[PDB]
């Protein structure tokens, strides 16, 4: 049940992929790669980077995986060029799906809901002032098309019931994304603009943002 997957291509090789900037207030806890392009590595801030012997990638105690930037040694820039392209294709693939299963459901106020599989369209912002559940099997899919902002209020949680998998939940979001302090998010974010995870928030999925990403001592576990 639910729509055909959004293929991330090589954007699925990153925990975080951004074009303008990635900032962390330590101590963030990122499982997977961090890439920035076309911006340079000086727009990776707060990571206390060490450049590794080849000059092609850097390391941080905040990241289990490699950081890469567009100014790094060959062939890193070509790799990120492809990843940024594949994120653009993924966003458009998700945003342009037609025939939604749910249209303006709950007016985009998702507190206390249980969301079954399908294609969701909101011509609005989406927020949640309370915990909500995504409920489906390990093979079901969700695509959440959001014309405005996406938020999850402080300390609130998305629960996966039934076997539902974060990698099968795509948030395709035109406006800014704000996960508030201590909130627990589930799914891949394909953001057209900025994504911010505030103090002690966590995301099981990926952050694939066409502008900036801001982390405040936040957890990103790639799914
Ligand atoms: Mg609500």
Residue numbers in the entry: 1 to 223
Verbatim from the authors:
To probe the molecular mechanisms responsible for AFP activity, we here characterized the antifreeze activity and crystal structure of TisAFP7 from the snow mold fungus Typhula ishikariensis. TisAFP7 exhibited intermediate activity, with the ability to bind the basal plane, compared with a hyperactive isoform TisAFP8 and a moderately active isoform TisAFP6.
The crystal structure of TisAFP7 T20Y was determined at 1.72 Å resolution. Indeed, both substitutions resulted in a reduced TH activity (0.4 °C at 0.25 mM T20Y mutant and 0.45 °C at 0.27 mM A214Y mutant), equivalent to a 60% and 50% reduction from wild-type TisAFP7, accordingly. Panels 1 and 2, the T20Y mutant covered only the perimeter zone of the hemisphere, corresponding to the secondary prism planes. The reduced coverage of ice planes by the T20Y mutant indicated lost ice-binding affinity for the basal, primary prism, and some pyramidal planes. The water network of TisAFP7 was less extensive than that of TisAFP8. This prompted us to propose that the antifreeze activity of TisAFPs, typically reflecting the affinity toward the ice basal plane, is correlated with the water coverage on IBS via the extended network of water molecules, as observed in the current study. In the mutant, the bound water molecules near residue 20 were removed by introducing the side chain of Tyr, thus truncating the zigzag pattern.
